[PDB]
Amino acid sequence: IGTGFPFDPHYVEVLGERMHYVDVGPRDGTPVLFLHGNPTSSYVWRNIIPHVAPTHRCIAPDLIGMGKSDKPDLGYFFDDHVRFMDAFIEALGLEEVVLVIHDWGSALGFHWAKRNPERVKGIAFMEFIRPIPTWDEWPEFARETFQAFRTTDVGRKLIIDQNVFIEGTLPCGVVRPLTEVEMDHYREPFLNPVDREPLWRFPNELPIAGEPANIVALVEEYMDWLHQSPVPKLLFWGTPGVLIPPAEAARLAKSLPNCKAVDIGPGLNLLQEDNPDLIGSEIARWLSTLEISG
Ligand SMILES: CCCCCCOCCOCCNC(=O)CCN1C(=O)c2cccc3c(NNN)ccc(c23)C1=O
Ligand SMILES: [Cl-]
């Protein structure tokens, strides 16, 4: 599994800040927009993109405050990410897109899709944010930890002072061992402790046991939209998963219209790190089927 990141940096001004993105593949056709989550960057897509770039433009931004994007003194609420990603998409002049989305990137993508349904041609998603009705529906092995993340004093000590989301949670979200080179690529945006704000605000935004109520409502709304939409859907899942257990993947594969589900084998949260070639290959092939009328 490749450890390099052989993509030239592209930058665009967005709301007075600068955002970094990968941009490879042909200039024409429908672009494929790849959205990462917490605590990753476009690096998480590095072994997926080469499967898609022969046929499609691939655009993979770093969320504001993450990767090579700027780090303004924000709270990095989900609202902030929404504002910056909306502006990012307009700054590149994107019209119609296919979305490839993960974790908080899926919350961004689905919320954008709900508001711009005529511009989304397809959605490939994995380990995505859905409402978690009670803590029992959060995986046991991760319960204590995320409950601690969702406090001000203890959670900030863990995530900001001790960098636990990078040094601990991240490798615990991959079944295979991450190498030192991979770990250094994930560490790079957060070497300065004060820059770790997004890593702490994100788990505090997760829609768990009804809180925070604003995020729960927004996530329910885009899941309702997703259930009503005929847009082509491709769902990757692994065993045991984290956000999406196999039973829920099986349920969604039937409840969501026009949904193809693909089992990647053993996987936790960063499915891209455990089976990039299957995920990349299946996305490339599915993209081709979007042009077959049937
Ligand atoms: C968008 C969703 C992304 C999800 C990707 C999920 O990955 C699965 C996440 O499970 C694994 C999460 N992290 C670790 O184990 C790191 C190691 N670690 C520590 O050092 C520590 C040190 C001091 C106190 C504590 C503590 N407080 N009371 N025990 C509770 C937990 C830990 C801890 C603790 O855990
Ligand atoms: Cl999170």
Author numbering: 4 to 297
Share the article's original sentences.
To overcome the issues of current PL and photo-crosslinking techniques, we here introduce a new method that can perform a photo-crosslinking reaction with proximal proteins using a visible light-activable chemical ligand (Spotlight) in a live cell. For this reason, we utilized the HaloTag system to efficiently deliver AzNP to the POI. HaloTag is an engineered tag protein that can covalently capture the haloalkane ligand within a few minutes in live cells with high efficiency. Since protein-ligand binding interactions and various “in-cell chemical reactions,” including the strain-promoted click reaction and photo–activation reactions, have been successfully realized with HaloTag, we expected HaloTag to be a suitable platform for our proximity photo-crosslinking system using an AzNP-conjugated ligand.
Among the photo-crosslinkable handles, naphthyl azide-based 4-azido-N-ethyl-1,8-naphthalimide (AzNP) attracted our interest for the following reasons: (1) it is highly stable in aqueous solutions, and has been widely used in hydrogen sulfide sensors;17,18 (2) it emits strong green fluorescence, which has been used in the fluorogenic imaging of alkyne-modified biomolecules in live mammalian cells; and (3) it shows good photo-crosslinking ability: upon UV illumination, AzNP can convert to the aryl nitrene species, which can covalently attach to proteins. To test this model, we synthesized AzNP-conjugated HaloTag ligands (VL1 and VL2) with two linker sizes (see ESI†). VL1 showed fairly strong absorbance in the visible light range (λmax = 375 nm, extinction coefficient value = 2230 M−1 cm−1; Fig. S3†). In this model system, VL1 successfully generated the photo-crosslinked product of FKBP25-HaloTag and EGFP-FRB that appeared around 120 kDa only in the presence of rapamycin and in the blue LED light illumination condition. In this reaction on the FKBP25-HaloTag, VL1 containing the PEG1 linker showed stronger crosslinking efficiency with EGFP-FRB compared with that of VL2 containing the PEG2 linker. Notably, we used an ambient blue LED household lamp (∼0.057 W cm−2) for all of our photo-crosslinking experiments in test tubes and live cells with VL1, which highlights the sensitivity of AzNP and the requirement of only low-intensity visible light illumination. We tested the specificity of AzNP-containing HaloTag ligands (VL1) to the HaloTag protein and whether it captures the local PPI network in various subcellular compartments in live cells. Since VL1 emits green fluorescence (λmax = 540 nm, Fig. S3†) and its fluorescence is increased after the photo-crosslinking reaction, we expected that targeting of VL1 and formation of POI-HaloTag could be readily tracked in real time in live cells, whereas other UV-crosslinking ligands (e.g., phenyl azide, diazirine) would not be visualized with microscope imaging due to their negligible fluorescence emission.
